[PDB]
Design an enzyme around this catalytic site. Structure first.
Site, PDB file in Angstrom:
ATOM      1  N   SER A 145      42.554  36.973  40.710  1.00 42.00           N
ATOM      2  CA  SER A 145      42.955  35.849  41.540  1.00 42.00           C
ATOM      3  C   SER A 145      42.290  35.998  42.873  1.00 42.00           C
ATOM      4  O   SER A 145      41.838  37.105  43.194  1.00 42.00           O
ATOM      5  CB  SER A 145      44.475  35.909  41.734  1.00 42.00           C
ATOM      6  OG  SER A 145      44.898  35.071  42.801  1.00 42.00           O
ATOM      7  N   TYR A 158      52.209  41.267  43.181  1.00 40.81           N
ATOM      8  CA  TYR A 158      51.173  40.618  42.391  1.00 40.81           C
ATOM      9  C   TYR A 158      49.796  40.901  42.994  1.00 40.81           C
ATOM     10  O   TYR A 158      48.850  41.225  42.264  1.00 40.81           O
ATOM     11  CB  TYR A 158      51.426  39.104  42.401  1.00 40.81           C
ATOM     12  CG  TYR A 158      50.335  38.269  41.761  1.00 40.81           C
ATOM     13  CD1 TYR A 158      50.307  38.064  40.377  1.00 40.81           C
ATOM     14  CD2 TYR A 158      49.403  37.593  42.541  1.00 40.81           C
ATOM     15  CE1 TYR A 158      49.352  37.239  39.787  1.00 40.81           C
ATOM     16  CE2 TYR A 158      48.436  36.766  41.958  1.00 40.81           C
ATOM     17  CZ  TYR A 158      48.441  36.562  40.581  1.00 40.81           C
ATOM     18  OH  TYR A 158      47.509  35.740  39.992  1.00 40.81           O
TER      19      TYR A 158
END
Ligand SMILES: NC(=O)c1ccc[n+]([C@@H]2O[C@H](COP(=O)([O-])OP(=O)(O)OC[C@H]3O[C@@H](n4cnc5c(N)ncnc54)[C@H](OP(=O)(O)O)[C@@H]3O)[C@@H](O)[C@H]2O)c1
Ligand SMILES: NC(=O)c1ccc[n+]([C@@H]2O[C@H](COP(=O)([O-])OP(=O)(O)OC[C@H]3O[C@@H](n4cnc5c(N)ncnc54)[C@H](OP(=O)(O)O)[C@@H]3O)[C@@H](O)[C@H]2O)c1
Ligand SMILES: O=C(N[C@@H]1[C@@H]2C[C@@H]3C[C@H]1C[C@@](O)(C3)C2)c1cnc(N[C@H]2CCOC2)nc1C1CCCC1
Ligand SMILES: O=C(N[C@@H]1[C@@H]2C[C@@H]3C[C@H]1C[C@@](O)(C3)C2)c1cnc(N[C@H]2CCOC2)nc1C1CCCC1
EC number: 1.1.1.146
Lengths: 264, 263
Positions: A145, A158
């Site tokens: 990401s 995350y």
């Protein structure tokens, strides 16, 4: 450069493939005539994906259900998927543990679970897959990401897990070039993608137009097939312009010789 | 910076029985800070406590234990806080023993690196935060060039250092929006002349390691000055390529884009 023929008859594993980007990747690979082995926890959802893959023209499609919180399942899943296809050309690591946007306070178990599922399982799957990938001069595709390259609030655990993937896989890529392991590693840096999970998690917090999941899935596969080190995919043209870190690349190339790796 | 900034400050130093950690404990002691040192070796920590007192520490204590144990990490902070009557600075420096090797299949080592080098830092931060909020204190996170850029032979170590950057940089953004007046300093270090580093690197790495005493001081300075990042390498030019301006641009650009009323 890319031709869908590059995937015809290729033996591909897609993790987190019951929905979102993973499911779309399984569908693209199926249309391309690859052999696919999909995984996630839900056997009922994986069955639907497998059946649609066969309908789309997959050379073969199978699923193996299990949780990536279990390192022994991760290890066994690869051996079984390899037996089902008679080898492995591409390992697409896409699964993550369920994550919501929140300020970090004291949820240590969630930090640990994020590290185990989003990071450690990828390492475990890579170890289990490497002998077959070495035989086929295959590819490892690591789904990451923008939060794994840059800092954002609300995704601490995350983000840590996605940054860990970059650190680990980028180091392993340097090791593969010196030890002559002809296996490519593609790190996919994604912006916001219009998956049901992302749209729900982000509502009322993020304004952003999310990129389409179908095109995202295709760009991941193309990058992996082309053995690109990194794939960048986002809806913002500005992030696209700024995301690359040419100075990190210069710094790594600069010190690549400074090592006496004869010992290894 | 002046050594007076640390006089009477309540500081925790982890991995303080040797190397950079020990040097930091010695600098803090010279500055007249209250120090609580930790590592696994009680006998080596006792010698550190005695030399700290002999350097002029306002107070010096140790608590021995392993950072593989999350419950130890949690209890250590509560105890260190009671020993000093608060906490101004939390210096997270310990790592699990690491050697230079090609990665093959040592999952145990990857996990241990993640637990000790990363998870324990998160645990110690959670346990320290209430006292740091009271004092508008500082968290200093010791990292490496291998925590910003990829190098061979340190895969599991690099993953753990990258994880620190991801986690603590995200938490720093959250602290600014939630008005938690606690600074977070990420220390990006090049090769340092610790006995551990010199042994691990011999015959492999052909570069001059920077001195540990000056490194220890630059970490403390950066933390005391509430700098977001401290860069310390024997080369000024890696210290040039190591910065990531486009990341800073990308983050500042997107800081307004978030609606935090849900929080
Ligand atoms: N969507 C975005 O905006 C966005 C942005 C950047 C990156 N990404 C990356 O894109 C990838 C895919 O995300 P996505 O949005 O498509 O996610 P998704 O739609 O929520 O899918 C998560 C996939 O993971 C599987 N999964 C969840 N927990 C699992 C566990 N413990 N073990 C095995 N599988 C598990 C889920 O299946 P079940 O629950 O049956 O297990 C499902 O197949 C992640 O690597 C994500 O970081 C997404
Ligand atoms: N030296 C370098 O060149 C260099 C370069 C970049 C970054 N750094 C960073 O600098 C920091 C210090 O490294 P250093 O070179 O000074 O290392 P060091 O001299 O090897 O000391 C490691 C410290 O960690 C403590 N420790 C090890 N395992 C532990 C465990 N399970 N629980 C609690 N404590 C443990 C050790 O004590 P005991 O074993 O008694 O427990 C000792 O006090 C690390 O964060 C490192 O990543 C160093
Ligand atoms: O990886 C990302 N999102 C994922 C989606 C949504 C959330 C968080 C993760 C994991 C999910 O499961 C749940 C799926 C992700 C990707 N790109 C951006 N960039 C732009 C968005 C805003 O401006 C920068 N931001 C995010 C997060 C959304 C808020 C902070 C970072
Ligand atoms: O954090 C670093 N070193 C640490 C020392 C030595 C080893 C590995 C870690 C953890 C240790 O415990 C053991 C202590 C570290 C710091 N700076 C550099 N850059 C310079 C190296 C070559 O060119 C730039 N390299 C390293 C590693 C040494 C070889 C590859 C990366």
């Amino acid at each position: 450069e890319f031709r869908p023929e590059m995937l015809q008859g290729k033996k591909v594993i897609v993790t987190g493939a019951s929905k979102g980007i993973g499911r779309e990747m399984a569908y693209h690979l199926a249309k391309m005539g690859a052999h696919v082995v999909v995984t996630a926890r839900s056997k009922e959802t994986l069955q639907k994906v497998v059946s649609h893959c066969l309908e789309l023209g997959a050379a073969s499609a199978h699923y193996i259900a299990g949780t990536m919180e279990d390192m022994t399942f991760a290890e066994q899943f690869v051996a079984q998927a390899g037996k089902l296809m008679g080898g492995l050309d591409m390992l697409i690591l896409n699964h993550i543990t369920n994550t919501s946007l929140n300020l970090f306070h004291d949820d240590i178990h969630h930090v640990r679970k994020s590290m185990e599922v989003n990071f450690l399982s990828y390492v475990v799957l890579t170890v289990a897959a490497l002998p077959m990938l070495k035989q086929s001069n295959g590819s490892i595709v690591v789904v990451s990401s923008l939060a794994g390259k840059v800092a954002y609030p609300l995704v601490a655990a995350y983000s840590a897990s996605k940054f860990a993937l970059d650190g680990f896989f980028s180091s392993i890529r340097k090791e593969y070039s010196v030890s002559r392991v002809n296996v490519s590693i593609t790190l996919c840096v994604l912006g916001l993608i219009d998956t049901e999970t992302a749209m729900k998690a982000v509502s009322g917090i993020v304004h952003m137009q999310a990129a389409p999941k179908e095109e995202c899935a295709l760009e991941i596969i193309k990058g992996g097939a082309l053995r690109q080190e990194e794939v960048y995919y986002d809806s913002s043209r500005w992030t696209t312009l700024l995301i690359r870190n040419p100075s990190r690349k210069i710094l790594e190339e600069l010190y690549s010789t400074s090592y006496n790796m004869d010992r290894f």
